[PDB]
Design a protein around this ligand. Structure first.
Ligand SMILES: [Ca+2]
Ligand SMILES: [Cl-]
Length: 443
């Protein structure tokens, strides 16, 4: 009975305004929804026909000319105190960080957005935005913005993709431009063309941390894209993962490019490629989920992960997905194993927990391998047996305390909807200190 209507917005950046959710992504694509389940596609590509920015090729001509492109990369739109909508647009040549980032402003979320000008460039041949010669091994690619207010109401923008890593700038709350004299801003992590991009920051008032979401790996079907997270007491860091690793340390080895091995150990990994599908039964399954945004609902205290994903056997086809997020006992989020369908955390009974589960282990790697299931059973006597062993306990209403092969995980038990099989399912989603995520789906 749950109804979904799909849309395709690459790198979706969530914004809620007055009861409606919008995503703005790359290629000036966008979509909206009232329930996070049925989306309506609004725009799909950059052309003089796109209503978000009429005559876009003229309006943003300096950007297309600098970046030597005919499209835009991953936008973010943020409403400021003046009530207006500020689109942080960016373009990149694609084979190098020859990029420009600017801001455009609209009275209405659906446009039209009016260019205010470019404020960052990368890929120049000479002096960069920080007054030193541009060097992609240490300077950012000026793409993948997220402009956000911290808990004090101060305005920031985090951004970056590959190249020199991820940076954050203090922003002017009145004009939407960075405050003067920062260059590229403060470095949060990265370097030497690490495969890390799409940063997104979400504060959680309950835990009192800022969560910096990141995409590791390549976006493509063979790229190993996965969603990771780290946290800090402050919006500008320092950020750390669940083991206490400083994210600032994360980078490829000097003199290398796309060094996945050096970066794999760092960050909490929330989701990578997987399938619950098995020879005997259908199941949900994603390839290269990533480029996420996140939403915190102040009225309910619920959080959501918003992202695009590809799918097993669908090549480079992508759609927007939304998965609810839950904070574990250690203040780290775990993702619901199934897409959001109106589910809420509820009281769970033990009798509804025991039984056989398909288990997915997202691990800690960057891998194009589609993670597959193994079968375990949660027994009445609180042991786990089958293809792995350990123990399970429930704490409070729905807290999952699970030991598997000598590692301790914490998360939640949750009944939700499997949209492929069209059935309710008991589920668990838990995380260990190594930042390794485990999902269970019953039966
Ligand atoms: Ca983004
Ligand atoms: Cl799905």
């Amino acid at each position: 009975k749950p109804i979904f209507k799909e849309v395709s917005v690459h790198d979706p950046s969530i914004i809620e305004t007055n009861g409606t959710f919008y995503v703005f992504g790359s290629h000036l694509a966008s979509a909206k929804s009232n329930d996070l389940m049925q989306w309506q596609q609004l725009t799909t590509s950059v052309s003089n026909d796109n209503p978000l920015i009429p005559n876009v090729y003229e309006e943003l001509k300096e950007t297309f000319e600098w970046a030597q492109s005919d499209t835009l990369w991953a936008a973010d739109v943020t409403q400021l105190a003046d009530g207006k909508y500020y689109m942080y647009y960016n373009a990149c040549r694609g084979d190098s960080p020859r990029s420009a980032m600017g801001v455009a402003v609209a009275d209405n979320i659906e446009g039209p957005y009016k260019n205010k000008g470019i404020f960052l460039k990368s890929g120049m041949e000479g002096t960069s935005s920080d007054g030193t010669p541009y060097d992609a091994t240490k300077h950012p690619n000026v793409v993948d913005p997220h402009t956000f207010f911290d808990k004090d109401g101060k305005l920031w923008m985090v951004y970056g993709s590959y190249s020199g890593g991820i940076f954050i700038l203090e922003m002017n709350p009145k004009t939407g431009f960075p405050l003067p004299g920062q260059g590229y801003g403060k470095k949060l992590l990265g370097g030497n063309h690490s495969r890390i991009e799409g940063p997104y920051v979400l504060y959680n008032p309950d835990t009192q941390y800022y969560y910096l979401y990141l995409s590791y790996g390549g976006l493509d079907a063979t790229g190993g894209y996965n969603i990771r997270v780290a946290r800090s007491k402050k919006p500008d860091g320092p950020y750390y993962d669940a083991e206490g690793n400083p994210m600032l340390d994360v980078r490829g080895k000097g003199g290398t490019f796309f060094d996945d091995r050096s970066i794999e150990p760092y960050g909490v990994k929330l989701m990578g490629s997987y399938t619950f599908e098995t020879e005997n039964e259908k199941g949900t399954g994603y390839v290269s989920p990533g480029a996420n945004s996140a939403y915190y609902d102040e009225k309910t205290g619920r959080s959501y992960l918003i992202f695009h994903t590809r799918f097993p056997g669908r090549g480079e086809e992508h759609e927007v997905r939304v998965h609810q997020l839950f904070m574990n006992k250690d203040g780290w989020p775990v993702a619901a194993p199934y897409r959001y369908a109106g589910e809420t955390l509820k009281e769970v009974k033990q009798k509804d927990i025991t039984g056989t589960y398909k288990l997915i282990q997202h691990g800690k790697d960057i891998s194009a391998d589609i993670k597959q299931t193994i079968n375990i059973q949660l027994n009445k006597n609180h042991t786990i047996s089958g293809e792995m062993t350990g123990t399970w306990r429930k704490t409070g209403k729905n807290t999952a305390d699970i030991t598997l092969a000598g590692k301790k995980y914490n998360g939640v038990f949750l009944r939700q909807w499997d949209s492929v099989r069209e059935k309710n399912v008991m589920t668990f989603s838990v995380l260990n200190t190594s930042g390794e995520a485990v999902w269970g789906s019953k039966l």
